[PDB]
C-alpha cells in the first residue's frame, strides 16, 4: 500500500520545489507517513535511473514529467513589481489577480504531471519496490 501525492509546490525563479508526500503500509519504509522536498531535476534523475536499471528492461517505465514553464507568468510579475507606484491601484489588483490565476494554471498542470508519474510508479507491481525510488520517496536529510 503506497499512496503518493504532491500537496504543495513553490515556484521560485531558479527552480520549482515539490513536496512529495507519502503514505504507506509497507514495512520496508521506516515510517508510515512522511514528506520530502524534491526538485523537478530529481524526478528526471529517478526516471533516468529507472530506465537504465537492467532488471527493469522489458518493463515500460512511466514517462517522465515535463519541465515546468512559468516563464510567461514570471515575466509579467517581474514587470508588475515594476509598476507599483505608477499604475492605477485598481489596475494593479486586477493585474495581480490575473497573473496569479495564470501561475495557478501552470501549477495545476505541472503538479499533475509530476504526481501522476509517481503514482504511476507506486501502482506498478515490480517498480514499486525499486530502491532508487524508495530513497527518492523518503530520504529527507536536507
Amino acid at each position: 500500500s503506497l499512496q503518493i501525492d504532491i500537496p504543495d509546490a513553490l515556484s521560485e525563479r531558479d527552480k520549482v520545489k515539490f513536496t512529495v508526500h507519502t503514505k504507506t503500509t509497507l514495512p520496508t519504509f521506516q515510517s508510515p507517513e512522511f514528506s520530502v522536498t524534491r526538485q523537478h531535476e530529481d524526478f528526471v534523475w529517478l526516471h533516468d535511473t529507472l530506465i537504465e536499471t537492467t532488471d527493469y528492461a522489458g518493463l515500460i517505465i512511466p514517462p517522465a514529467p515535463t519541465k515546468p514553464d512559468f516563464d510567461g507568468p514570471r515575466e509579467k510579475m517581474q514587470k508588475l513589481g515594476e509598476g507599483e507606484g505608477s499604475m492605477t491601484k485598481e489596475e494593479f489588483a486586477k493585474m495581480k489577480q490575473e497573473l496569479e490565476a495564470e501561475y495557478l494554471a501552470v501549477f495545476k498542470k505541472t503538479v499533475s504531471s509530476h504526481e501522476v508519474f509517481l503514482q504511476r510508479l507506486s501502482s506498478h507491481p515490480v517498480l514499486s519496490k525499486d530502491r532508487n525510488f524508495h530513497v527518492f520517496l523518503e530520504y529527507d536529510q536536507p
Binding site: 521560485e12 507568468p73 496569479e100 501561475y103
Partner: peptide, 21 residues
C-alpha cells in the same frame, strides 16, 4: 516573484500565494 501553490483540500479549490524574494 516566488509563487506558492497549495492543493485544495478536497474539495477545496487550489490556491497560489506570493512569497517574498
Amino acid at each position: 516573484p516566488a509563487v506558492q501553490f497549495f492543493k485544495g483540500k478536497n474539495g477545496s479549490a487550489d490556491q497560489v500565494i506570493l512569497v517574498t524574494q
